[PDB]
Amino acid sequence: YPLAAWQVIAGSDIKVGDNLTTGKDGTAVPTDDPSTVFGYAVEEAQEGQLVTLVIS
């Protein structure tokens, strides 16, 4: 069901607009190297909290 945005457990602290990639245990962590980027967060989240961001 093609989702435009997901809710993924943050593997660290994530700021709004941060590009995200996979982390430990499949968690979402901040990145900076295009290739690892699968989505951009739309809200701030602390480690262990869900963060919702658009795919793209």
Added chain:
Amino acid sequence: RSKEISIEVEDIKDAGDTGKRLLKINTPSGARNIIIENEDAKALINGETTNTNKKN
């Protein structure tokens, strides 16, 4: 969501300064201007030498 994601030269994170200049260059003359620093040698390779270039 597009098909190609045409990156740009400056997205290539381990490219060198001369390497990026060469990748952007459009013609062989432009490449020679980047690569050959000695002006007399560049003049010989361009087939265009002054009397000063010839002496040097």
